[PDB]
Design a protein around this ligand. Structure first.
Ligand SMILES: [Cl-]
Length: 291
C-alpha cells in the first residue's frame, strides 16, 4: 500500500458507520498559527468538537457526518496538524489559551462545545475564560477528577518514555494497525484502519510515525474545579457503559460543583472513545442538546 490518499478520501465509510446516505458535506482544513482544524459545512460552525489525548480532529468524522450540522473539529496542540510544543505541555489550561483567539476567529457563533477526555477539560477552561462563546458543554467520558486519576496512573510510564531517543519509528502501516488492534481487538478493523490512517504519516524513509506528540504532562485540576464552580454554561456528561474512566462518585461530584448539570447519558457497549465505539448513539444525544 503506497498512500498519497487525500485526508477526505474515506468519508463514504464515515457516512455508512453513521447510517446516513446522500452527498458528503463540504469539509476543508483551516489553520491559524499553532492550531489546525477541519471546518465542516462552510464558514459558520454551530458546534466545536475537541478530541482526546492521542487523537486528532478526524475522530469526529462519523459524528459530524451523521449530525449534518456545520462544525469545527480542532486539532489540540501536540495533535493532528497542530504544532507540537518543546515543553510537551498539552494541559487543558494551555490548550485553552492557544485555542480561544482561534475559536473567536473561526467559530464565534458556535454556542455548543463537545469535548472528549483532554478535549472535555479544554472545553471547561474555554467556557471559564471565554463565556461569551460557550453556551453549552457536552463532556465525553471525562471529569477533572477522572483525568487526574488517569494522569497519576501513567506518571511513571510518561517519566520513562521521556528518557528514550527519537519518537518511535515503524517499519509499516500494518505495525501501527497491529498495536491499535491489540488495544481494541473486538472493534471493526476497517474503523481501526481509518483511525490509524488519520493519526499516522509515512516518512520518506518508507517508515511511519504517529501525528501526536507523546504527552509528557497535563494541568491544575483544583483550578479546573474552580472553573466548573464559576462556569454558567450547562454541562451534559456522556459516559461509555463499558468505561470505568468516570465513576458514579465522579458524576455526583460534577453534579454538585456544576451550576447547571443536565445529567449523564450512559451509552451501552461504548468504551472511553464514545465517538469511535457508538457514534450513532452520540449523534442522537448531541442532536438532543441542539434541541
Ligand atoms: Cl486524554
Amino acid at each position: 500500500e503506497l498512500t498519497g490518499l487525500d485526508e477526505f478520501a474515506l468519508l463514504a465509510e464515515n457516512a455508512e458507520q453513521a447510517g446516513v446516505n446522500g452527498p458528503l458535506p463540504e469539509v476543508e482544513r483551516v489553520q491559524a498559527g499553532a492550531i489546525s482544524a477541519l471546518r465542516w459545512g462552510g464558514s459558520a460552525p454551530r458546534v466545536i468538537f475537541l478530541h482526546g489525548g492521542g487523537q486528532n480532529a478526524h475522530t469526529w468524522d462519523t459524528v459530524i457526518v451523521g449530525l449534518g450540522e456545520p462544525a469545527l473539529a480542532v486539532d489540540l496542540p501536540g495533535h493532528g496538524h497542530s504544532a507540537w510544543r518543546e515543553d510537551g505541555n498539552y494541559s487543558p489550561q494551555l490548550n485553552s489559551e492557544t485555542l480561544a483567539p482561534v475559536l473567536r476567529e473561526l467559530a464565534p457563533g458556535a454556542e455548543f462545545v463537545v469535548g472528549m477526555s483532554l478535549g472535555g477539560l479544554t472545553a471547561i477552561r474555554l467556557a471559564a475564560m471565554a463565556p461569551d462563546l460557550v453556551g453549552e458543554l457536552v463532556l465525553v467520558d471525562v471529569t477533572p477528577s477522572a483525568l487526574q486519576r488517569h494522569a497519576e496512573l501513567t506518571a511513571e510510564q510518561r517519566g520513562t518514555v521521556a528518557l528514550m531517543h527519537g519518537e518511535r519509528e515503524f517499519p509499516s502501516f500494518q505495525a501501527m494497525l497491529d498495536l491499535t488492534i491489540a488495544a481494541a481487538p473486538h472493534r471493526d478493523v476497517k474503523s481501526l484502519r481509518r483511525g490509524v490512517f488519520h493519526n499516522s504519516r509515512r516518512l520518506d524513509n518508507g517508515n511511519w510515525v504517529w501525528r501526536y506528540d507523546a504527552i509528557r504532562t497535563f494541568g491544575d485540576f483544583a483550578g479546573l474545579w474552580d472553573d466548573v464552580d464559576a462556569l454558567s454554561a450547562p454541562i451534559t456528561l456522556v459516559r461509555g457503559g463499558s468505561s470505568g474512566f468516570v465513576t458514579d462518585q465522579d458524576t455526583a461530584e460534577l453534579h454538585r460543583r456544576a451550576t447547571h448539570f443536565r445529567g449523564v447519558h450512559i451509552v451501552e457497549k461504548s468504551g472511553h472513545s464514545v465517538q469511535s465505539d457508538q457514534p450513532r448513539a452520540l449523534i442522537e444525544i448531541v442532536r438532543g442538546v441542539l434541541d
